[PDB]
Structure formats: C-alpha cells, structure tokens
Design a protein around this nucleic acid. Structure first.
Lengths: 141, 83, 23, 136
RNA sequence: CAGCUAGUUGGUGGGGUAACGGCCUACCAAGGCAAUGACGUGUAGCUAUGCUGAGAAGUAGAAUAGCCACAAUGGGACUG
RNA sequence: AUUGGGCGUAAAGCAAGCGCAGGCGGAUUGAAAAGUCUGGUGUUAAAGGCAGCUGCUUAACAGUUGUAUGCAUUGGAAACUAUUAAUCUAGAGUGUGGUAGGGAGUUUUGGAAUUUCAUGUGGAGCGGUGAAAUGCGUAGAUAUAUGAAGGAACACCAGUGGCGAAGGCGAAAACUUAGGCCAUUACUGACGCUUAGGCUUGAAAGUGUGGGGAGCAAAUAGGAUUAGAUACCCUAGUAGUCCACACCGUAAACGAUAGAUACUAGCUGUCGGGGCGAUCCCCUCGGUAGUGAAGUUAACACAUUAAGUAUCUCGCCUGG
RNA sequence: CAAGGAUAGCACCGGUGAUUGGAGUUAAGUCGUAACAAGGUACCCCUACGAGAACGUGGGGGUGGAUCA
C-alpha cells in the first residue's frame, strides 16, 4: 500500500488526532493519517470495536524513524459518518485522570469513554467494573 | 553572504555531524560575529540586529541543551553563554 | 511498509442510495 | 481566556455603581469600628426639602429631600409618601430602591416608620405611609 | 508596597525557663528571605459549627465545643 | 463564563521581533511511581447536617443512631507525564545542491529641474480664485536660452509583484549582509514551543545641537466672502519639511484578525524556485489573491493566506 | 534592670483652607452649522500651534469616505 500525507509532531498526538478528525468531519473526508503510539493504537482498536470509528492501519518506515497510523471513519452508503463527536481528554497542558467510580456514560448512556488505567486501557463500563482508574484519552459518543 | 559551507565543514568533525548541535551552535556564533561586523559597518540595518538577538537567544537554548545532554560541553567551553 | 493491518477492509463508493424499494 | 492564561488573568465580575451603601454603616466614638449591622432603615437628619422637575417625558413637580445620615455620606432622595412630611430638619429612616426620574435622586425613604407616620385615608400603602388600621 | 534583614546567620564553650533550641551570652563570624513579589503594612479570633444554590463557589468562625487571646494597658517576682 | 464566554465592524491580538520566571512538550524501552488508580488504618467531635426514631398536643424544640469530612501512615501497578537511564527523526531545525526580494545599511553620481546671479532682448503687464482682489512688474517685466552655484526629491518601469519583524522597501549604479523559495530516510537526537518580567527596534510630528534652506505651508499677517477667516481663495510667511545625533518610541504600526505548530471542496490569476522541453503547454511547492463548499461570525461576511479545524504560551475584555 | 520620661533631626498618614478644574441634570438658554450625503471642506490617527467653538492648518500613518471599472 501507499500511505500519503505524513504528519510530524504538531504539539502532541492528541491534538494532532483531533484536528484530523474534525477536518474529516468538515470536508466529508474518509481516511486521514496521524502519529502512532501505544495509547493511540489501543484507543484506535477499541474504537474499531466500539463502532464509532472504522478500521485503521499502523505503518512504520523501518523503526521509530517514522511511525504513523492511517484511520478511516465508518460511513453508511450516504456519506454519513458514524462519528457524531469525539473530544480529546488527555492533554499536555492538562493531565486529566479519573477513578473507576467516577466515569460517566456519554451521549444518553450510550457513548463510551476510552480510559487508560494503572494496568491497561479499556472502555468506561469495564473500567468501572475493573475497580481500577486512570487517565481518560477520548470521550466518544 | 551566508558564510555557510566553510564554517560548517570546519565544525564538521565527521560525516555524522552535518546538522548536529555542534555545527548549529558554531553557525550561530559565526553568524553573531559576522552580523556584529556587518551592523557596525551598516548601522541602521535593524534586520541585522533583530536577527543577531534572535541568534543569541537560539544559541542560549542550544547551549542549555548541550549542557543538559553532554557533560563535556563546558569542560572545553569556547562557547560560553554570556553574550 | 506494512506493520499491522487491523481489519484491512475499508468502506468505499458511497452511492446516493435511500429507500431502495418503493414499488 | 484559556485556563493557562486564566490563572494569570482571572475572572473579573460585573461592577455596579453606588446605589445605597451608607444605609448599612455608621461611625461612633469609643472605637470607630464601623457599625457593621447592615441597617435596613437608618436614622438621620434631613437638610433640605423641596419640589423639582423629573425627566422630560415624565415631568412633574415631584418632592425631593437632601438628607444626611449618621455616617459621612449624605444624599438626595425621593419621598415615596403622598405629600412630603420632611421639613429640612426632620429625623427620618431611609430605604432602598432607585429613582430613574429625579436627577440627583437614587433613593426611596421608609414612609411611615418611627418618623413620617400617619399619611391617613389609605387602602393601599398602609404598611407604608404608617397608615392606621382600615377602620370603617 | 522591591528590596528587606546586623543574633541577621550559624558554630565551640558557658549559663538558661519545664526543656531541646542564639532560649541567652563570652568567643568565632556575613550571612538569612526574596520577582512563584521579598520585607513592611493593617486585619480576621482557627477547626467543627452558620446559610444560599445541583454545582462551582460565596457568605461568619461573633457567642459557642476544642484550641487561642486579652482579661484597664505595660512589666517584675512569688505561689501553685 | 474549569465548571460556565469573546477578541474584523457592538471589550478586542500586545506597535514589531527575540527570550526567561513559569508553562507544556515527538516515538520506542527500562528504573521510580509524585501525578494516576488501588488495599487499609488513625483521626476529621457528641451536638450540626443526609437517612432513622423518640418525646414535648406536634414540629417549633430537645435527645439520639449508620453516615459525613481532611491529613498522615501503609502492598502494588508502568499507561504516560514532572524525573531518570539510552536510542530514532519527524517537531527546532541543520546539511547539501539549485535559489529569488524596490530587504536594510554603506558608497557614488545623473537628471526634471526649484531658486538665485551675469549675459541679454522685451516695452506694460504677471499673478491667484467659485468670483476677484492681496501679492509680484518699468534698479527693465511677462518670458526666454546659456553659464554658474545651493538645497530638495527622484517621470515610466510598479504589477489579483516579491521581500523586509511591524515600522517599510521604486533615478540608477556597486559592496557587507539579515533573511527567502525549491527537494533532500540525508545530522545532534526533542536539542522544541511561545511568552508576564526582561532585550532590541520602532512612521512621524515637534526639541535643541551644525550647515546650507530650493520650495513652501503650523503659527502669524492683508485683501475677499461670510453672520465672521488665523476654515475652504491666494499672496508674504517661520518652526518644519533636509541631513548628522539623541529624545520624542505614539500612528488608521488595525487585517481593529498575536506568536510557534499541523490539517479543510474546488475553481480561476500572479510571482519565485525545482524538473522538462522553440517558446510554450505541463507538473511540484510555496508566496501572493479572490468567488464559493464545508465550517464559522446575530448580521455584515471570512473561507486553503479563515473570522474553519485544533495544541503550548502570552496580551486585551463587562453597561454609558 | 525598668513602665516609662527626651532632645534636635527626620519620616508616615488625615482633615482643613482666600481660590477652584471636571461630571449627570432643567420637555423651554448664546453664536455658526463644523460634522453625519464626498453632509455645505471627505473623514480622520499620531503630533505643533492657534482659534469662544464646532474646530483650522502643518509633517507623516490610513480610508473606519463617496465617485468608479
């Protein structure tokens, strides 16, 4: 394959992802590329499984030399994205964390927040069930 | 003009430092000297003085890194951060 | 250069389609 | 603006011009520690009483009184009573509110209290005006 | 309100309240706090308890329970 | 207005550039786990309150129970941050090669001629407005041409041009040199980012300092006109416009749109650079533009150069 | 030893005081309409002076003016 339009360090992976997501929502665009990270891979896999986001492909040049991820949004056959709003939570200027018992259901009890904890990254419901809390990466609904 | 290649290759110890911190700080110091010479020969060139202050600042930050990473930067300090 | 293709399927060609049966 | 700058430039709430502070504090000898009791109606000696013209659309010869409170501030007020019972020296207890017609006037007065009692012949404003019980 | 602070700053020895403590002193000293604004300045008695609002927070710690302070102001000693 | 708001015209981005206090940071991995969760105990008072009951006729009131509530002390986790131990480039960038701007300054002149003087001739007008007049002309004008001098500023090229940090850059010629445009897994390996404080610069009036001052106009002064001209008319006309120095350091320096950073239908133009080839067409990237999608301002509209999208930092903002 | 009592120098803060700038307010005070049309002169911004004053003129910054393709 050929993954085009690489992005360098903007100021962080989270805002680099958010700007691409909102630009894809704006221009009705299908697939966009951003930086690669263990947290980004975890949240992207969990969003593929959650249904808000479509698949993704993580690519490398040879090593840490360049690691990116291309990601597509799930679209019905009407150019309607499955993403109805995603908000980044983990930020450089503000490191946000919440306990397992203080995680809400987004949308109307439907939206799923992505939460990394002391021992892994998971969804809000199973984060509450795990009895282990930590940082929040993205509120997705 | 830029006075680029000769100063780089003088600061280019090996083929592994074409854009290293060493050659960068050497370029900034040489540019500070050349800009002082020019702006003394050309007084009202405010572009030159603003660029000189910008290079002084970037040289300060380059030196703070070069002392943060390598501890041998100040044991042979011919580039002391004072200007 | 391929590292991992997480579900390599990608949606494409979103035709203008709605209420396909009206007869 | 942003939180990082908001820490250095905090929130600046709205400000209001002077309405009626002097009714709530007054001085006294033997420890000038102010009378922090927030008096609702505070005694004071009036200075001038008369009538003057409010704004153009709603003009009148409406009653006014320059009154002086116990504390330093003295102010020009309106008498919300039917007729004026202030004689440029009557001790009277002030009220809140603001008058948007008479210039120099931003106040109302408790009509009926320990002084300025008995306007009389009243169905409304008997708790005010100091009007007695409505005997037939 | 940008500089403030000469036990200031700490050390040996000695003395010291109930005692460690420059607590204080003989001797030896020049350092201590500070643009995250030092020093100074005046004030509030501090916690629980007192209200409003969902919340953010604001509103007193009057009196009070605990602690704390004067007990007319400032000292000294004695008792206990 | 974290919760719970703006910065184009109804607060508005610092006048411009650089920076620390301070703030945050790209990828992988390990230590540590402060931040993070987690396991607990102590205490955070009875009275007070949440839930509960009793009696006071009933709560008012009084009593009362499970529960609040903040610190310390305690096993861990590595997900990252503040830290540490290394690396990789892709952010700062740097290298190479191609590589342009009226960039600034420095150093020169050249002219349209402005004014003046002599050569002259000319033989009663010049001049100025909406109207005239004031003013200038008969020591010879109007005007004319030569020669000489002193100052000022450079006709066209001037761009849906580029660059310079804004301030700005245009008669040409040279130099020093900031910086730029194009593509580089190329090199340190985050060296980064801004910015309160801090550093420098900063149209200009106008200040004095030394020259000339060519010309003129603040002020001032006459004739108009006016209800009156030191306003609109002009003539006379200084500071000043000119330069050297500081200071003045403000501007409609406002795009009333901050700096660094990455992304968003297109379309039609331009300039520069890279490739190519009669030119050219064309492609690449920027710069420089716009209608307009989407998106966003009440609205006016911006719109790939946003007032669109988002991160770090700062400045400005609550009624007249 | 001491509550305290002092000197000449100074220092901090408050009110007052012949005389007085500035603000809102009287549908009914004085001149001319500068200026709002390109608003009777286009607006102004920074700065010098003067003018009752709207303001007027200088050197620069701009159109937050119309005309007009």
């Amino acid at each position: 394959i050929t993954t085009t339009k690489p992005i360098k360090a903007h100021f962080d992976p989270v805002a680099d992802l958010l700007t691409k997501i909102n630009n894809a929502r704006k221009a009705k665009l299908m697939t966009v590329t951003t930086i690669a990270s263990k947290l980004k891979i975890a949240i992207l896999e969990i969003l593929v499984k959650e249904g808000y986001l479509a698949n993704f492909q993580v690519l490398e040049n040879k090593s840490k030399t360049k690691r990116i991820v291309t990601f597509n949004l799930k679209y019905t056959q009407r150019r309607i994205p499955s993403i109805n709003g995603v908000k980044q939570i983990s930020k450089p200027g503000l490191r946000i964390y919440r306990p397992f018992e203080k995680l809400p259901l987004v949308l109307n009890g439907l939206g799923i927040a992505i939460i990394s904890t002391s021992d892994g990254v998971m969804t809000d419901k199973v984060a509450r069930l795990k009895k282990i809390g930590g940082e929040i990466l993205a509120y997705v609904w | 003009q830029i006075d680029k290649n000769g100063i780089i290759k003088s600061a280019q110890l090996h083929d592994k430092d074409v854009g290293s911190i060493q050659v960068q700080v050497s370029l900034l110091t040489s540019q500070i000297k050349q800009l002082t010479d020019h702006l003394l020969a050309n007084k009202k060139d405010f572009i030159s003085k603003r660029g000189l202050y910008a290079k002084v600042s970037k040289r300060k930050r380059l030196l703070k890194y070069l002392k943060h990473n390598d501890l041998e930067a100040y044991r042979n300090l011919v580039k002391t951060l004072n200007l | 250069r391929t590292e991992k293709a997480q579900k390599p399927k990608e949606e494409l060609w979103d035709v203008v389609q709605k209420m396909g049966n009206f007869d | 603006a942003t939180i990082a700058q908001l820490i250095r430039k905090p929130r600046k709430k709205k400000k209001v011009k002077s309405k009626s502070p002097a009714l709530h504090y007054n001085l006294n000898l033997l420890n000038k520690k102010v009378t922090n009791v927030y008096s609702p109606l505070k005694r004071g000696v009036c200075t001038r009483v008369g009538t003057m013209t409010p704004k153009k659309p709603n003009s009148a010869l409406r009653k006014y009184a320059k009154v002086r409170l116990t504390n330093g501030f003295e102010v020009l007020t309106y008498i919300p009573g039917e007729g004026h019972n202030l004689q440029e020296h009557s001790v009277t207890l002030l009220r809140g509110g603001r008058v948007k017609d008479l210039p120099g006037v931003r106040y109302h007065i408790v009509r009926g209290t320990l002084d300025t009692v008995g306007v009389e012949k009243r169905r409304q404003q008997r708790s005010a005006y100091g009007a007695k019980k409505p005997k037939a």
